Structures are given as structure tokens and as C-alpha cells.
């Protein structure tokens, strides 16, 4: 007899680096190797009680008593300098492949059935569709999260570095490519071909992604926001702290990774809301809701169980969803 | 009710048993609780810090104490799924509100 394993873990593929941030002037972007780095600084703020307080309080004496409290805090902030209109981010990522095998298991028969199942999926159709989705998500500058709204022109440069020197190059415009749909383009097909070759294990891939965003002079950039310990007082960045590699503002790697896998379009409840990041019980914390609700038979777990045990292979888009979840990696045990 | 009365009595005994208010080296959250749950602003304490502690009573100290009490009481989904656990949560909320009112009346 055959039953599902009790411990099961998959090492991730598609590992990004951390995204360092540098600044300079537009049309110097063929010499953006010595641009200075953006620096997080300090700022003071004295505000008011703007929150929706507890209503049916007919006491305005406590209200203008609370108005006389300046509640001063201290805020970290990072902005563009005065002489620069363009922001430059940079990271690397590798593609690993061998995305079928787990990293821990109890059963052996379950593991072999899973391996031959992903072998049947690969021999049916390779990684071409998924690498098309990933290259499309890489082409538009989705990984700039809040540094993408209100931008004039965003241009990304891609380098595939086989040896220590660059082998091939792309050069895209972001805002021509949509954040909604998946089109076809010959350079995008070449990039997706390279990524799908990497995911199949036929050769190793190292990429380098550089973006440029012409916001303007002196505006505010958004790096990742840290965790504040409440053990201190109202001073010492009591409001927020910004993530920084040594003397440089930067973005967390899981932010880049969450942006890269925003390809779930087969969630059933709607289609006009665009693609989603792929995970079991496909949910977004911004909306605070959960698509792929498991009482509908469309979560990752029930589909995987019906595929591996009872051989009820689902529709091809759901198989894309399952293999993308396996490429994400995680802990799938009780 | 006995636990709340014992906590209030232990706080009062620790406060009145304290001869003076010392600046605690590295009292992590102990100063934030002892702005109200600690003694009056003596010569070892700053007068501006004493005026700031008299400006705001320790409501957040009461929230932290209610959180520590709710963490001390082992809860589960059987109380959340049952109506008796909801009634026990309502009774604990009423006791925490009475304790916060007794603290805020003496505080400030």
C-alpha cells in the first residue's frame, strides 16, 4: 500500500541576491559602475493624533488635552541626492534545477512515485511556459515595489555571465511591458529559453539584473523596513528602521523573490485582478484574503494528493501551478 | 478575582516596600512598566520624567499585564469554539477593565 510521507522538504530554486541601491544622473547609464550609494539618515517628526479614536466619546476636553501632546518621534529616511534623477538597483540570481527531488523524506515509495510523476510532466512539456512567465516578470521592473509608481521611464539591463566576463546581453523598457498580461517577443523568448535550460539542469545560469528609474531630483526611495524593539523609549528610531548593507540602503532578498514569482493567473475566483504570487492557499496579505480556499478542491495539497496517489492528474494549468509551487520550495509535512 | 487582587496587592507591597526609586541599569521594560507601577519620582529620578509619568498613566502597562496573564492561562480553540470560553474571556476582560480602572484612578 502507499501513503503520503510525513516529513517532506524541498530546497528552493531561483535564489536572488540582495538588491543594493546606487544613484546618479540619466544618460550616464553606460558608465554606472562608480555611482555613489544612497545613504539612510535621521529625521525628527512631531505630529498629531490623526487616528480614528473611540467614538461616542462626547468629551472634547480630553481631545484638546491630547492635541497639546506633540508626540515627537525619530524617523529613518533615505532620499535621492540633489544632482541625480536616476535610481540604480542591482542584484544577481542563479538558477539551479533538479527541482523534482526533495531534501528530506520518510517513505521511499512515495518519493519514487513523486519523481516519476515529475518525470512524466517534464517529458510531456518542459519548463518553457514557466520560464516564459518568469522572464516576463523579470522584464517589467516588478521587483521595484513602490519605487515603480510615478516613474517616467524604466530601463533594465540583463547580463548572462558565463565566465568572469559577460556573454550575452538584453536591454528592455519596463513600461512597454505590462503588469497584467503575458505577450511574446523574440528577446523574451531567448531569455525564457535560457531560464528553461537552467531549470532542466542542462547548464548552470548566473544572471545580473540592473535597473534604472528616472524619478527625478531629491525624491524619496523605499528600501525594506526593519523590526523595531519596543524595549526602548520614544527615541532611537522609535518609528521605523530601514534595512541596510554596510553604508547602503537595500531591499531584502525575499522581497525580490516574492516579486519574481507573481505568476498565478489560474486562481478561480476572478481574472481581472492580475497575477498572484504562487503559494499553497494562494493568498495576498495586502487584501487579507485567501484564494484557492481548500474547501474548493484547488489548493496545492489536495491537488498534489489526488495527482500522486489516485493518479487523477488535473488540468495543465493546475499542473503548472503545482510545479511552480515545487520550484518555490518549502516545508510540506504535518 | 483572587488572582487580580493578589496582583494588585503584590504591586502595592512592592511599591510601598520600595524605599526609593533607583535608575535600574538595563531594566528591560521594567522602566516602561515602573513609570506607573514603580514609586514616585524621587531625587534619583528626573523631575521631567516624573512629570511625564504623571502626564500619562500606565494603560500600556495594564495591557502588557493582561497579555502576560492571558499567556499564563493556557487557552485553546475549545474555549474559542465553545460559549463558556467566550464567557470566561468576557469575565477576564471585565476583571482586566476593573484592574485598569483601579490603576488609572491611582495613576496620574
Amino acid at each position: 500500500i502507499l501513503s503520503t510521507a510525513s516529513v517532506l522538504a524541498f530546497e528552493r530554486k531561483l535564489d536572488p541576491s540582495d538588491a543594493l541601491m546606487s544613484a546618479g544622473a540619466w544618460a550616464q547609464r553606460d558608465a554606472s559602475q562608480e555611482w555613489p550609494a544612497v545613504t539612510v539618515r535621521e529625521k525628527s517628526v512631531r505630529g498629531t493624533i490623526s487616528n480614528r479614536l473611540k467614538t461616542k466619546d462626547r468629551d472634547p476636553a480630553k481631545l484638546d488635552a491630547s492635541i497639546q501632546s506633540p508626540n515627537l518621534q525619530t524617523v529613518d529616511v533615505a532620499n535621492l541626492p540633489s544632482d541625480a534623477d536616476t535610481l540604480k538597483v542591482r542584484f544577481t540570481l542563479r538558477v539551479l534545477g533538479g527541482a523534482g527531488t526533495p531534501s528530506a523524506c520518510n517513505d521511499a515509495a512515495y518519493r519514487d512515485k513523486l519523481l516519476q510523476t515529475v518525470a512524466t510532466y517534464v517529458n510531456e512539456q518542459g519548463f518553457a511556459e514557466l520560464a516564459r512567465r518568469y522572464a516576463h516578470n523579470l522584464a517589467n521592473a516588478r521587483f521595484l515595489w513602490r519605487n515603480r509608481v510615478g516613474a517616467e521611464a524604466v530601463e533594465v539591463r540583463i547580463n548572462h555571465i558565463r565566465q568572469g566576463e559577460v556573454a550575452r546581453t538584453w536591454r528592455f523598457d519596463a513600461l512597454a511591458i505590462g503588469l497584467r498580461d503575458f505577450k511574446a517577443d523574440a528577446e523574451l523568448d531567448a531569455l525564457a529559453e535560457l531560464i528553461a535550460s537552467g531549470l532542466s539542469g542542462s547548464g548552470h545560469v548566473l544572471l545580473e539584473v540592473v535597473a534604472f528609474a528616472r524619478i527625478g531630483d531629491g525624491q524619496e526611495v523605499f528600501p525594506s523596513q526593519e523590526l523595531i524593539l519596543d524595549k526602548g523609549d520614544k527615541k532611537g528610531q522609535k518609528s521605523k528602521t530601514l534595512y541596510s548593507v554596510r553604508d547602503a540602503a537595500a531591499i531584502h532578498s525575499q522581497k525580490i523573490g516574492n516579486a519574481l514569482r507573481t505568476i498565478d493567473t489560474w486562481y478561480p475566483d476572478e481574472d481581472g485582478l492580475g497575477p498572484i504570487a504562487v503559494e499553497p492557499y494562494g493568498s495576498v496579505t495586502s487584501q487579507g484574503k485567501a484564494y484557492r480556499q481548500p474547501k474548493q478542491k484547488l489548493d496545492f495539497y489536495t491537488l498534489l494528493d489526488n495527482w500522486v496517489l489516485r493518479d487523477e492528474a488535473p488540468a495543465v494549468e493546475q499542473q503548472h501551478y503545482v510545479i511552480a509551487n515545487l520550484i518555490r520550495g518549502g516545508v510540506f509535512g504535518e | 478575582g483572587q488572582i487580580c487582587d493578589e496582583a494588585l496587592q503584590y504591586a502595592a507591597r512592592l511599591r510601598e516596600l520600595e524605599p526609593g526609586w533607583s535608575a535600574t541599569p538595563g531594566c528591560q521594560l521594567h522602566d516602561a512598566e515602573q513609570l506607573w507601577l514603580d514609586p514616585l519620582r524621587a531625587q534619583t529620578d528626573e523631575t521631567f520624567l516624573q512629570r511625564r509619568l504623571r502626564g500619562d498613566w500606565p494603560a500600556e502597562v495594564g495591557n502588557r499585564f493582561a497579555n502576560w496573564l492571558n499567556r499564563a492561562v493556557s487557552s485553546d480553540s475549545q474555549i474559542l469554539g465553545s460559549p463558556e470560553a467566550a464567557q470566561w474571556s468576557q469575565e477576564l476582560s471585565k476583571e482586566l477593565t476593573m484592574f485598569k480602572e483601579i490603576l488609572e484612578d491611582e495613576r496620574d
Binding site: 500500500i1 501513503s3 503520503t4 510521507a5 510525513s6 516529513v7 520518510n106 517513505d107 494528493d305 496517489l309 489516485r310 509535512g333 504535518e334 | -
Partner: protein, 227 residues
């Protein structure tokens, strides 16, 4: 003069002293070759007082030994995974397990109680067979204190127990709490022929017990199942 409570011994220290004007003596409580506690007691103490001076340490040692060498627990769950229907304490594992999560393909599953569970699906008749075969006696934790080579079923590796090991189960101080007379009646012998076994040294008129009598006695006391 020593005092013997099962496998424990309480000896005095052969030269007293005067504490507070009264004569005293040091006492030591042993468990085989291992010394556990030392107290200083006055004279004019009967042996019952020296007994219940150490009774609490004896009871605590019993509690810890009972908890440490407890046998494993299997459980019977339905198709969802929670709501355990019955439990059983086994002395061995049913040899066919491999890490599982129950699904809707079967209505009955037999999981372990340890956390990365192993499990098997059953059908309530083979479950009764496993419960008959692999169950555990009520006093199975005493087997954790025994050297194992006196517990094997193979006759080639077995050796007879010594008197100190044999006092773990027989005698009023032992963990089973059964007498020598009752154990002699359990084997169909005289009291004297059974006292021949527990003398202390084979030079001083003492015989080894047999293989069959030893295993049958462990069976009848509810220590080892001995199928």
C-alpha cells in the same frame, strides 16, 4: 547491621559521634554499587524510623524510573486524522510502519504517539490481532532496570540472574511487592526450596534458577509477556 529494602541497602558507619551532646551515627543508602544519600541520625532509633527517613527518596526514584522506561503508545484514528478512538500500550513496533498522513481512502488508521508519526491503515480485525500480539504487561517498566542478557529468549545467550537482580521482583521490598511465599506458590514449590534460590552466594548453599522457571515467573508476575 544493614537493612535491606529490595535492591536497596542501608548501612551504618561503624563509629559514631556526638552532635549536640547526643550520640549519632552516619547512614548510607546504596543501590547496588552506587551510593545515593547520606544522613546523620541519632541512636535510640528503631529500624522503622531509619526506613521512613529514606522512604521518600525511594519513592522518587521509583517515580522517575517508571516515567523513563514507559512503553510506547499506539492509537486508532478515523479518516480525518484527529479524534482518537482507542489507545494501546505496546512493547514492540509492528514492523510494517512507515511515515504516513491519513486520507479519505480508508476509514481507519493506526498511528504512533510520537510526533513524526509512522502509521498504517487497518480494518479493525487485524487491529485486534496486533493488540493481542504486541501488548504490554502492567509492570513492563521494570525491564528497563535489567541487564537484557538475563531477558533474552534465545537459550544460548541467556545466563541466570544473581541474587541482587532477583531481588528486583521477589521480596516485600521489590517493585512488584510480592512475597517469597506467594512466588513459591506461583511456581508450585515449597517456601524452603524457593529460599534456596535467594541465599546470596552459591558457595553458601544456593542454586541457579532454570531458564523455564525464570521466564514463567516473569510471565506470571506481569513483567514480560513471554509468548
Amino acid at each position: 547491621n544493614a537493612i535491606h529494602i529490595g535492591p536497596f541497602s542501608i548501612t551504618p558507619a561503624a563509629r559514631g559521634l556526638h552532635y549536640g551532646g547526643l550520640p549519632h551515627h552516619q547512614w548510607t543508602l546504596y543501590y547496588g554499587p552506587r551510593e545515593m544519600a547520606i544522613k546523620t541520625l541519632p541512636d535510640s532509633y528503631t529500624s522503622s524510623e531509619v526506613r521512613d527517613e529514606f522512604s521518600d527518596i525511594i519513592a522518587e526514584f521509583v517515580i522517575d524510573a517508571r516515567h523513563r522506561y514507559a512503553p510506547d503508545v499506539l492509537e486508532l484514528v478515523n479518516s480525518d486524522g484527529d479524534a482518537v478512538l482507542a489507545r494501546v500500550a505496546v512493547s514492540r513496533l509492528p514492523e510494517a510502519l512507515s511515515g504516513c498522513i491519513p486520507d479519505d481512502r480508508f476509514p481507519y488508521w493506526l498511528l504512533t504517539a510520537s510526533r513524526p508519526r509512522l502509521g498504517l491503515p487497518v480494518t479493525l480485525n487485524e487491529y485486534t490481532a496486533l493488540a493481542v500480539e504486541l501488548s504490554a504487561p502492567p509492570l513492563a517498566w521494570i525491564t528497563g532496570l535489567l541487564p537484557g542478557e538475563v531477558l533474552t529468549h534465545d537459550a544460548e545467550e541467556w545466563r541466570p540472574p544473581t541474587s541482587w537482580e532477583l531481588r528486583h521482583v521477589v521480596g516485600e521490598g521489590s517493585f512488584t511487592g510480592v512475597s517469597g511465599a506467594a512466588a513459591a506458590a506461583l511456581l508450585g514449590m515449597s517456601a524452603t526450596n524457593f529460599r534456596k534460590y535467594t541465599a546470596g552466594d552459591s558457595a553458601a548453599n544456593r542454586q541457579k534458577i532454570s531458564f523455564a522457571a525464570w521466564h514463567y515467573l516473569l510471565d506470571r508476575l506481569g513483567v514480560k509477556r513471554a509468548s
